[PDB]
Write an enzyme that holds these catalytic residues in place. Structure first.
Site, PDB file in Angstrom:
ATOM      1  N   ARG A 185      -0.080  -9.094  -7.283  1.00  0.00           N
ATOM      2  CA  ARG A 185      -0.606  -9.037  -5.906  1.00  0.00           C
ATOM      3  C   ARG A 185      -2.090  -8.858  -6.015  1.00  0.00           C
ATOM      4  NH1 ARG A 185      -1.329  -4.719  -1.669  1.00  0.00           N
ATOM      5  NH2 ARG A 185      -2.030  -6.127  -0.032  1.00  0.00           N
ATOM      6  N   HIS A 192      -8.507  -8.523   2.403  1.00  0.00           N
ATOM      7  CA  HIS A 192      -8.380  -7.142   1.951  1.00  0.00           C
ATOM      8  C   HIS A 192      -9.760  -6.546   2.075  1.00  0.00           C
ATOM      9  CE1 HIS A 192      -5.818  -4.346  -0.768  1.00  0.00           C
ATOM     10  NE2 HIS A 192      -6.885  -3.647  -0.382  1.00  0.00           N
ATOM     11  N   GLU A 212      -3.492  -3.690   5.502  1.00  0.00           N
ATOM     12  CA  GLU A 212      -3.805  -2.385   6.161  1.00  0.00           C
ATOM     13  C   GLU A 212      -4.804  -2.574   7.293  1.00  0.00           C
ATOM     14  OE1 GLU A 212      -4.845   0.404   3.073  1.00  0.00           O
ATOM     15  OE2 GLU A 212      -2.849   0.467   2.265  1.00  0.00           O
ATOM     16  N   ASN A 268       2.861  -0.409   2.262  1.00  0.00           N
ATOM     17  CA  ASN A 268       2.051   0.387   1.326  1.00  0.00           C
ATOM     18  C   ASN A 268       2.362   1.844   1.578  1.00  0.00           C
ATOM     19  OD1 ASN A 268       0.913  -2.089   0.549  1.00  0.00           O
ATOM     20  ND2 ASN A 268      -1.102  -1.529   1.344  1.00  0.00           N
ATOM     21  N   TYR A 278       1.979   5.892   0.344  1.00  0.00           N
ATOM     22  CA  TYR A 278       1.361   6.932  -0.486  1.00  0.00           C
ATOM     23  C   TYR A 278       1.791   8.306  -0.072  1.00  0.00           C
ATOM     24  CZ  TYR A 278      -1.631   3.229  -2.315  1.00  0.00           C
ATOM     25  OH  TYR A 278      -2.113   2.092  -2.954  1.00  0.00           O
ATOM     26  N   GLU A 333       2.288  -1.759  -2.210  1.00  0.00           N
ATOM     27  CA  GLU A 333       1.534  -0.748  -2.968  1.00  0.00           C
ATOM     28  C   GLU A 333       2.296   0.588  -2.989  1.00  0.00           C
ATOM     29  OE1 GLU A 333      -2.516  -0.061  -1.688  1.00  0.00           O
ATOM     30  OE2 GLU A 333      -2.916  -2.289  -1.292  1.00  0.00           O
TER      31      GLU A 333
END
Ligand SMILES: OC[C@H]1CNC[C@@H](O)[C@@H]1O
Ligand code: NA
Length: 437
Positions: A73, A117, A162, A287, A289, A346
């Site tokens: 990616r 991005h 994002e 994504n 986290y 991610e």
């Protein structure tokens, strides 16, 4: 065990790794401007060199191969492709990515390409950037051009990475490029990002030489009230709306969430746009986290919700670790929203990594981070979540935005002075875990 055809990869973004910022006709991006503005980056660094992956993506490929990955990616830098943002193409930029795509395919690595991005061409920013509807149109035109040239070989495409960050960190909190600080500008940006995305999906399907699998990539933060008080529950819902539902609901054909429209009031952006935004997708990238454990904070900036730290959870160099949030958010998507299949585009962590006396990087907490999140993915899969792959952020240490080169997320260590890469212990664990499948 994961499915035999499960996608196993690592992820990067162009501005974070490429360097060569003026080479071969590349234009100026908002992150070139921002990182060259004194005090915007914690450690005085820029993306001028970064990992020099413009020149060294072969080495990055060598890493991916040594890890036994089957996918990569990465993003395409809009400033390399249309240096003025709106204007003529730069064939030398397209040719660079063409060669890279061929190198990847030759190595058996499927390219999962991100169009945007965060590296908006500066001339677009000069005309309000994501504050202007014209930016949506020209993003779609960029998407058209890239897919015409690469879409014979690349099937899996993400329009944005994002949008919440681009809009809220870039235009509201001012910590990311371009560095604006106004809520209304943030919310306008969120709309024009989403419109951009929708216009691009349509453009790409028309431009493509074959059917594509098109997605968008969202950061999602599962949110949990610190108590069951109406105040803390409401704060949780507001934070959940601010990050997650604001993007999920319009993508799902549900309009913007009404509770958030009411809350934002006159700051909210100005039916046809909503239809375009909801252009049907072939997959959604998650994504993941961290969670948000929310307390009401009536004196804080919108969304008037603050994190309640838990000192008993592990922390990395920059975040709280909560693997169970990945299961929760996936179950929610599966049961409550129409996107499928899903990819973890991610997941990863930052630590104060160093080369030890033996030559290894002993990043045990990152190993344990992968193991814990992969276990949650097994649970999600057991629940019927249609998950089709996983990408570790990041293949290698890189330019971590406002934290610069100082905040290391790689599964591979990057020596920023010599440009040598070395696999960390967690990278070897992934290798051997993936091999065992
Ligand atoms: O902060 C870690 C990462 C979060 N997702 C977007 C990436 O570009 C970033 O490095
Ligand atoms: Na810690």
């Amino acid at each position: 065990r994961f499915p035999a055809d499960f996608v196993w990869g690592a992820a990067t973004a162009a501005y974070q790794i490429e360097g060569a910022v003026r080479e071969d006709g590349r234009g100026v991006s908002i992150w070139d401007t921002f990182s060259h503005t004194p005090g915007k980056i914690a450690d005085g660094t820029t993306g001028d060199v970064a990992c020099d992956s413009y020149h060294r993506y072969g080495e990055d490929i060598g890493l991916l191969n040594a890890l036994g990955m089957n996918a990569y990616r990465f993003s395409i830098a809009w400033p390399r492709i249309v240096p003025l943002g709106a204007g003529p193409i730069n064939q030398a930029g397209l040719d660079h990515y063409s060669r890279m795509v061929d190198a990847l395919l030759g190595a058996g690595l499927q390219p999962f390409v991100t169009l945007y991005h965060w590296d908006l061409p500066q001339p677009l920013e000069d005309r309000l950037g994501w504050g202007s509807r014209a930016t949506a149109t020209v993003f779609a035109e960029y998407a058209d051009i890239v897919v015409r040239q690469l879409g014979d070989r690349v099937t899996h495409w993400a329009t944005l990475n994002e949008p919440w960050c681009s809009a809220m960190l870039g235009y509201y909190l001012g910590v990311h490029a371009p560095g604006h600080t106004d809520l209304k500008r943030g919310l306008e940006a969120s709309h024009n990002l989403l419109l951009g995305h929708g216009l691009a999906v349509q453009a790409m399907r028309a431009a493509a030489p074959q059917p594509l699998q098109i997605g968008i990539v969202l950061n999602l933060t599962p949110t949990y009230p610190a108590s069951d008080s109406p105040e803390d529950v409401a704060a949780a819902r507001r934070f959940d709306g601010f990050v997650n539902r604001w993007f999920l609901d319009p993508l799902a054909g549900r309009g913007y969430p009404q509770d958030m429209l009411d809350y934002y009031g006159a700051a909210a952006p100005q039916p046809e746009d909503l239809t375009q935004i909801a252009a049907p997708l072939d997959w959604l990238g998650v994504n993941y986290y961290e969670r948000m454990r929310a307390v009401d904070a009536p004196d804080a900036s919108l969304p008037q919700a603050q994190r309640l730290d838990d000192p008993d959870l592990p922390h990395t160099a920059d975040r709280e670790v909560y693997p169970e949030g990945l299961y929760d958010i996936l179950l929610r998507l599966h049961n409550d929203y129409p996107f499928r299949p899903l990819y973890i585009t991610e997941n990863g962590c930052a630590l104060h990594d160093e080369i030890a006396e033996d030559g290894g990087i002993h990043d045990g907490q990152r190993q344990a981070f992968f193991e814990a999140h992969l276990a949650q993915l097994q649970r999600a899969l057991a629940a019927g979540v249609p998950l089709k792959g996983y990408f570790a952020w990041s293949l290698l240490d890189n330019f971590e935005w406002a934290m610069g080169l100082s905040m290391r997320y790689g599964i591979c260590y990057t020596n920023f002075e010599t440009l040598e890469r070395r696999i960390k212990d967690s990278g070897y664990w992934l290798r051997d875990f993936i091999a065992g499948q």
